[PDB]
UniProtKB/Swiss-Prot annotation, chain A:
Localization, UniProt: Host cytoplasm, Host perinuclear region; Host cytoplasm; Host endoplasmic reticulum
Protein name, per record: Non-structural protein 7
Chain ranges of the RdRp Nsp7 cofactor domain: 1-72
Quaternary state and interactors: Interacts with nsp8 and nsp12 to form the replication-transcription complex (RTC): nsp12, nsp7, two subunits of nsp8, and up to two subunits of nsp13. Eight copies of nsp7 and eight copies of nsp8 assemble to form a heterohexadecamer dsRNA-encircling ring structure.
Recorded superkingdom: Viruses
Purpose of the protein: Plays a role in viral RNA synthesis. Forms a hexadecamer with nsp8 (8 subunits of each) that may participate in viral replication by acting as a primase. Alternatively, may synthesize substantially longer products than oligonucleotide primers.
Swiss-Prot record, chain B:
The protein's name in its UniProt record: Non-structural protein 8
Renumbered ranges of LRR repeats: 30-57
Domain RdRp Nsp8 cofactor: 1-186
Gene name for this UniProt entry: rep
Organism whose genome encodes this protein: Severe acute respiratory syndrome coronavirus 2
Assembly and interaction partners: Interacts with nsp7, nsp13 and nsp12 to form the replication-transcription complex (RTC): nsp12, nsp7, two subunits of nsp8, and up to two subunits of nsp13. Eight copies of nsp7 and eight copies of nsp8 assemble to form a heterohexadecamer dsRNA-encircling ring structure.
Compartment annotation: Host cytoplasm, Host perinuclear region; Host cytoplasm; Host endoplasmic reticulum
Full-protein interval shown: 3948 to 4133 of 7096
Annotated function: Plays a role in viral RNA synthesis. Forms a hexadecamer with nsp7 (8 subunits of each) that may participate in viral replication by acting as a primase. Alternatively, may synthesize substantially longer products than oligonucleotide primers. Interacts with ribosome signal recognition particle RNA (SRP). Together with NSP9, suppress protein integration into the cell membrane, thereby disrupting host immune defenses.
Length: 72, 186, 620, 187
RNA sequence: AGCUGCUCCCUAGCAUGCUACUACCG
RNA sequence: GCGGUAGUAGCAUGCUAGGGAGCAG
């Protein structure tokens, strides 16, 4: 359960990086800090906090079609 | 590699020698069969080797070009495979707090800044219509990301502060509906 | 040693290259004609020519690498992020460089999960990742040179430690070579600043004939050429979220340092059974041989290992100069006395206090070692041996001699004091005797700043050889660092090897008829290498496959571990190799109709291939 | 080889040999024809198997010649590049201040670290946070290195222009915060 | 974007060597 | 019948070269 959240964090930062987010220094710094803090966590209750925080960044942009990728 | 022409020769003389070893015959006609087989096992043992190596040469060249094609085509689709994998993994993770914000974003309620973790700090969320306001807002409390927040201010699209009491079903078509709620974590 | 102390009084703007105006073709240049060192004083070049008609290829090469023209034509820089000296900005913008995250190999992770891995409470879990960095990482990593401080030495003790250290290097041979005897691996790497604008090292090795290279080498024995070093961020797997950097040195420096040092370096890397073990492979029984050689015949033996905090940033300049002189002591018949001094000056001006290109700006390096020059791993070994010898001397001279019960050791102590503080020239007989004593009671195995020691415990409990606190004291007063005993280790049982050496653990196993020593890695390192990559290189296993063959070779000895969760790594790798082969063949036959005629590949998922790599009969 | 002298001899030798075999004259005729076609294939062996090392060696030489020509062109290209760079960077330092400080030296030698300090016309300052900005580059002009500089243009880590009225203590948390100031030397 | 050391796989070339078959001669 | 030299085919050891990859300091 910890392994899954760490792998998801890696993939999430890759997606954020290829959406040209590092062109804003503050946002990239915060994203890097959250990604590095998730990978060093030892209990799986703060990793989910930081995952909510880090996924809100992707949810606040408009470069992804949420209705299409979530066809289930 | 028996489909080669020279095989028909190599068997032919060999067949002769079979008859020879069945006959028990003289000395010279066996020299015949030790002078027209060693020319057969030499005219054939050269054609049936280079072609055998050529088959594997063709196979390895085809594999090399296939490797190049697939590697070329894999790094042209990163931007779609990565998003598909991300959402598959998120769906498998099965978390309540993540599902809440994902479904809200699917309907239209999206945040405007990073969601804060401290009990302090300000949150701003967009509201596209009244149905989401009704099942999300209740009085002065806001349920978001499996957490509870207290409302501080509501506005509309023209940046004009709107008091909370007037937000209702009948007055709805009188406000610029992309509302922006500001709240603070409990 | 005296210059080091006296140079702290004078302004820091008076050190570095000295420049002058010359007239090529009737137009004025600004070029370097000398140098002002903090340790060596003022040095002037011997061949300086005003009024030149035109420049040849090697004159252009020398003038392009000089920082004089680059610094004289740039802007003034005031950088408040660091405390180091800043010279100039070479452009109108500052560059901020980041590090990317890694790529996830989801197929391998799914396969591993479907075989019972990564369960809750397991003893094997992922701890090696690719960590990402933001735009402030390069200057914040360069700022660590603030731990280098001017250090004066005890000269009379150092002048004896240097003789013992030099005796540790007596079996080798060296000297200068010609340009057609030099061996270059990987001619497709960077060539440093200026030169990374136009090509790689291949272009500069191809455009110069064997006579141009000889002329440049002969030039460097009468003149000084300063150069520029570039700093580059690294992209690799790790366990800590610290950023790592490497130094890229100019081609003008490497080309000549190879001709100076390569013969001795290749002599060192081809010897078996000595103290320095650079070039010895761990395969086909090499680990066992190394361990049995280091065990020697010490009497009440224990094993010990220690640590160097901030090794490359904190090393004082006197020890680096000493290492260079020890290495150069092999040029007694090919070089005169002025040639050797100018070679030392060139090395100091290029890899000790050179100018550093970080971002798009030039800074001054206070000191330390640059990890990208042509002699790093051997200078590090000399430094290691020097510190160990110093610790032993300090341990022996600070013991009350009225309590030493052995007559021989008491006489050795008396003569050691006389040889440091009462004699002025070298005494070779006592150096012989002290070297023999050290080799009998203090055995070492050294790689470039890594070490294992087998020592007499009865002597170390009486103060006759170095303990682990002597190292702490020596590092405190000669290296300006505090070494904590939570990163050092001791071992009282020899049937278990060293606790750590080169990130490997040791284990004694029955193999055939006898018991041997085998090394094994950390399982999480192997699994992390399998799971996180840099695109295409994995995430499609069928296209490489050999990656997993190499990773299974590295992980074979885990099958002999008492813990059962450790052999599962080797068996998982074998099963994945078989799966990849089957999938590639299935694709190939379903899409052309083609079959590999004869496989000769089933050997890759059977363990005899991997077992044969650790048995003493070399088949490389 | 197809049209070399050995071919005609060998071909006609075996043609006559097998025509006489179709005649079938003697027992020494077979031996003689087989010896002729043993020694005439001993001509088509040296002339058709060792003649082909000549061509291979000539091709070795030709490929080496091509390689040497290409390596010789690349050298000229890089030479031109280097000397163009040197001459283009020369055209900025030949000022009158450099001549002054070089004619004030007692031998013509000066330390390099003072050449930008006393002759550069433009200065760049990199500032990490607000207190450092308030201590160094305050206002429109400031003093440094025994000179006086006047500010023009301020940018941030995103390389976007910032006005001097936005750098306050309240607006500080809204800026990308390495700041890069560019100033000109005042006479 | 660096300096070294070790290892695995594929291709090509040459030399050497082994072995087998044809020819000449003694 | 044997020895030698000249040929053709297969196998073995190492030596150079080119390419891909893994580990350690
Ligand atoms: Zn020499």
């Amino acid at each position: 359960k910890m392994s899954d959240v760490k792998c998801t964090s890696v993939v999430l930062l890759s997606v954020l990086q290829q959406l040209r987010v590092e062109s804003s220094s503050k946002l990239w710094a915060q994203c890097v800090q959250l990604h590095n803090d998730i990978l060093l966590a030892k209990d799986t209750t703060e990793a989910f906090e930081k995952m909510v925080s880090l996924l809100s960044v992707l949810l606040s942009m408009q470069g992804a079609v949420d209705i299409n990728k979530l066809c289930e | 590699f028996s489909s080669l022409p020279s095989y028909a020769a190599f068997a032919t003389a060999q067949e002769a020698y079979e008859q020879a070893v069945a006959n028990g015959d003289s000395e010279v006609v066996l020299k015949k069969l030790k002078k027209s087989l060693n020319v057969a096992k030499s005219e054939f043992d050269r054609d049936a080797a280079m072609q055998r190596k050529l088959e594997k040469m063709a196979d390895q060249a085809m594999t090399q070009m296939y490797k190049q094609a697939r590697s070329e085509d894999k790094r042209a689709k990163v931007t779609s495979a990565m998003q598909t994998m991300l959402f598959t993994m998120l769906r498998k993770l099965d978390n309540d707090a993540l599902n809440n914000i994902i479904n809200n974003a699917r309907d239209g309620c999206v945040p405007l800044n990073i969601i804060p973790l401290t009990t302090a700090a300000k949150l701003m969320v967009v509201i596209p219509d009244y149905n989401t306001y009704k099942n999300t807002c209740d009085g002065t409390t806001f349920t978001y990301a499996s957490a509870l927040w207290e409302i501080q201010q509501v506005v509309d699209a023209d940046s004009k502060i709107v008091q909370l009491s007037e937000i209702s079903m009948d007055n709805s078509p009188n406000l610029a509906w992309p509302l922006i709620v500001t709240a603070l974590r409990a | 040693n005296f210059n080091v102390l006296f140079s702290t009084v004078f302004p820091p703007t008076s050190f570095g290259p000295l420049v002058r105006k010359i007239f090529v073709d009737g137009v004025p240049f600004v070029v370097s004609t000398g140098y002002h060192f903090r340790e060596l004083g003022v040095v002037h070049n011997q061949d300086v020519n005003l009024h030149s008609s035109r420049l040849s290829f090697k004159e252009l090469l020398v003038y392009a690498a000089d920082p004089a023209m680059h610094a004289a034509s740039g802007n003034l820089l005031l950088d408040k992020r660091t405390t180091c000296f800043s010279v100039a900005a070479l452009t109108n913008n500052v560059a901020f460089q980041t590090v990317k995250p890694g790529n996830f190999n989801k197929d391998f992770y799914d396969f591993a999960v479907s075989k019972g891995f990564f369960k809750e409470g397991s003893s094997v879990e992922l701890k090696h990742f690719f960590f990402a960095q933001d735009g402030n990482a390069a200057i914040s990593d360069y700022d660590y040179y603030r731990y280098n401080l001017p250090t004066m030495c005890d000269i009379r003790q150092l002048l004896f430690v240097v003789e013992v250290v030099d005796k540790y290097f007596d079996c080798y041979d060296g000297g200068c070579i010609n340009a057609n005897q030099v061996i270059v691996n990987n001619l497709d790497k960077s060539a440093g600043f200026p030169f990374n604008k136009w090509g790689k090292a291949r272009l500069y090795y191809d455009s110069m004939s064997y006579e141009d290279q000889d002329a440049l080498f002969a030039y460097t024995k009468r003149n000084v050429i300063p150069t520029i070093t570039q700093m580059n961020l690294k992209y690799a797997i790790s366990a800590k979220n610290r950023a790592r950097t490497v130094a890229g040195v100019s081609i003008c420096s490497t080309m000549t340092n190879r001709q100076f040092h390569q013969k001795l370096l290749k002599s060192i890397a081809a010897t078996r059974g000595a103290t320095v073990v650079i070039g010895t492979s761990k395969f086909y029984g090499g680990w066992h041989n190394m361990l049995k050689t280091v065990y020697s015949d010490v009497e009440n033996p224990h094993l010990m290992g220690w640590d160097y905090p901030k090794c490359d940033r904190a090393m004082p300049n006197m020890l680096r100069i000493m290492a260079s002189l020890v290495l150069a002591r092999k040029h007694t018949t090919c070089c005169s006395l002025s040639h050797r001094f100018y070679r030392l000056a060139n090395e100091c001006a290029q890899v000790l206090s050179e100018m550093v290109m970080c971002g798009g700006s030039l800074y001054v390096k206070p000191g330390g070692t640059s990890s990208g020059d042509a002699t790093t791993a051997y200078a590090n070994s000399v430094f290691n041996i020097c510190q160990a010898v110093t610790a032993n001397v300090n341990a022996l001279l600070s013991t009350d001699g009225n309590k030493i019960a052995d007559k021989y050791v008491r006489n050795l102590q008396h003569r050691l004091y006389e040889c440091l503080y009462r004699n002025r020239d070298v005494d070779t007989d006592f150096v012989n005797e002290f070297y023999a004593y050290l080799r009998k009671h203090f055995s070492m195995m050294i790689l470039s700043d890594d070490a294992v020691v087998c020592f007499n415990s009865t002597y170390a409990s009486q103060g006759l050889v170095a303990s682990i606190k002597n190292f702490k004291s020596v590092l405190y007063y000669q290296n300006n660092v505090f070494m904590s005993e939570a990163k050092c280790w001791t071992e009282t049982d020899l049937t278990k090897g060293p606790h750590e050496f080169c990130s490997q653990h040791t284990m004694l196993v029955k193999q055939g008829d006898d018991y041997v020593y085998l090394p094994y890695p950390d399982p999480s390192r192997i699994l992390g290498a399998g799971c996180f990559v840099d695109d295409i290189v994995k995430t499609d296993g069928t296209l490489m496959i050999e990656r997993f063959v190499s990773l299974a070779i590295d992980a074979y000895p885990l099958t002999k571990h008492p813990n059962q969760e450790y052999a599962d790594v080797f068996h998982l790798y074998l099963q994945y190799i078989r799966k990849l082969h089957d999938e590639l063949t299935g694709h190939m036959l379903d899409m052309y109709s083609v079959m590999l005629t004869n496989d000769n590949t089933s050997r890759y998922w059977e363990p005899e291939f991997y077992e044969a790599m650790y048995t003493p009969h070399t088949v490389l």
